[PDB]
């Protein structure tokens, strides 16, 4: 249940927590951070991050108006996604597209990918989390926990609900790994 997830994320019933800091590699080679890092290029360099996935692409108060050419000639491969951190959102419409990029990302041998959003708390962890499930055979309670353990995160219940569905596509296709 999404409730099953809420509790993984809280600290009892009720308290989710917030990022003690702007960027955290939540899994080897894969980093989840916020707007600033994304827009602080000499850091992405020292971080040796080579790919960006802006999962909150746009110009509203809840988006990062970065874009391809913004990353041109510091040579960082870019991929944008105009998502909305609201329960309505079907972020689960970009799972493949995203995972497919994270995979190409990792394939280089010194490949480091920064999946990010505004706060690096919902839209972002969500993609990343979905990549572990269909790409590392992990069940939902699992990826959440790794990711969660590595960064303080909190996806909206819609996004939560989207992952569970994902869980049973996989689980019932025997794509899991119990």
């Amino acid at each position: 249940s999404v409730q099953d997830l809420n509790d993984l994320l809280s600290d009892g019933s009720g308290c989710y927590s917030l990022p003690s800091q702007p960027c955290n590699e939540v899994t080897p080679r894969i980093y989840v951070g916020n707007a600033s890092v994304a827009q602080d290029i000499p850091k992405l360099q020292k971080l040796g991050i080579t790919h960006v996935l802006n999962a909150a692409e746009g110009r509203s108060f809840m988006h990062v108006n970065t874009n391809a050419n913004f990353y041109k000639d510091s040579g960082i491969t870019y991929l944008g996604i105009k998502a909305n951190d609201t329960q309505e959102f079907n972020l689960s419409a970009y799972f493949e597209r995203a995972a497919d990029f994270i995979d190409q990302a990792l394939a280089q041998k010194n490949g480091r990918v920064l999946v990010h959003s505004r706060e690096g708390y919902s839209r972002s962890p969500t993609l990343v989390i979905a990549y572990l499930m269909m790409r590392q055979k992990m069940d939902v309670k699992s990826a959440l926990s790794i990711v969660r353990q590595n960064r303080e995160i909190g996806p909206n219940d819609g996004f939560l609900a989207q992952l569970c569905q994902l869980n049973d596509r996989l689980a019932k296709e025997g794509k899991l790994k119990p």
């Binding site: 989710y16 003690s20 800091q21 702007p22 819609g158």
Partner: peptide
């Protein structure tokens, strides 16, 4: 170092 930052409350 380590700041509090924000935001996610999922309704």
């Amino acid at each position: 170092d380590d700041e509090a930052t924000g935001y996610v409350a999922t309704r």
